[PDB]
């Protein structure tokens, strides 16, 4: 039609471009909140690993089933810059090794986009959790972690892994698979029996590693969301620039047409 419809499209896209520029910084702010939560949970996991190491070396009387021979983390929301896709693409690479080995697979799912993926290809879900906040709590993971631990004690699983993204840098989320279950001068003064202590500590150790994988994936999500909103801001800028060129053509045509109708009218009078 003309200049008026183009001017309305420009204003609409201009309003959207301003918030995608602001939301990029909101995602960076939430990325820093997730990065401080990643560091705060490390002392607990490393000390549990130090205790189990000595408590197993020093006590050759008992070998826990976890010392002799997938949990998938995903987001609940949009704006992910290939985060979930790079992870699902990678899961198939390790599963291919299991297909050559002839081994059976059990799956556990964390997040709504992961549940939507396996439901769209017929994947066998043994356990599943979703709709977690951007700052999750470890007590919600206990359920999904226990079903996967029980399947190991029942002899249904030979090895278990956690599938999640790792924070290489603020511009790079790396898809990974990490093995969970299969892992000197003094001795401890055990009040309860050592089996009860080792059995209790190994459960806390695996739960802590799953929680750390979940918190690091959330840091990767905010970093992926920053890139996605940066790109949306840049893409809208190209569309506004092109629409400005179409508008200028309509501005010149309107002036030329009005003068051509005016000159014709004055020539007749």
């Amino acid at each position: 039609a003309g200049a008026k419809e183009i001017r309305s499209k420009i204003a609409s896209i201009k309003s959207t471009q301003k918030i995608t520029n602001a939301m990029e910084k909101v995602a960076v702010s939430k990325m820093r909140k997730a990065q401080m939560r990643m560091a705060a949970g490390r002392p607990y996991a490393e000390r549990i690993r130090q205790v189990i190491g000595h408590l197993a070396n020093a006590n050759p009387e008992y070998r826990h089933p976890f010392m002799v021979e997938y949990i998938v983390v995903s987001s609940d929301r949009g704006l992910c810059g290939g985060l979930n896709i790079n992870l699902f693409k990678s899961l198939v690479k390790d599963m291919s090794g299991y297909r050559e080995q002839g081994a059976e697979i059990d799956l556990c799912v964390i997040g709504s986009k992961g549940a939507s993926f396996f439901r769209s290809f017929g994947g066998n879900v043994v356990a599943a959790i979703s709709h977690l906040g951007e700052e999750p709590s470890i007590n919600d993971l206990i359920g999904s972690v226990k079903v996967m631990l029980d399947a190991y004690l029942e002899g249904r699983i030979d090895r278990l892994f956690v599938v999640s993204n790792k924070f290489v840098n603020t511009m790079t989320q790396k898809p990974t698979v990490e093995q969970l279950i299969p892992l000197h001068h003094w001795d401890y003064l055990y009040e309860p029996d050592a089996k009860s202590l080792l059995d209790g500590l190994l459960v806390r150790y695996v739960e802590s590693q799953v929680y750390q994988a979940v918190v690091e994936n959330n840091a990767c999500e905010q970093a992926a969301r920053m890139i996605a909103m940066k790109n949306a801001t840049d893409n809208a800028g190209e569309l506004i620039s092109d629409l400005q060129l179409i508008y200028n053509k309509a501005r010149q045509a309107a002036i030329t047409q009005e003068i051509s109708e005016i000159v014709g009218g004055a020539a007749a009078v």
């Binding site: 204003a11 609409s12 309003s15 959207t16 918030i19 995608t20 939301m23």
Partner: peptide, 14 residues
């Protein structure tokens, strides 16, 4: 008036 065009592309929840 400025928020109306925002909600239609990126949603209200943001």
């Amino acid at each position: 008036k400025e928020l109306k065009d925002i909600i239609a592309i990126l949603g209200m929840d943001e």
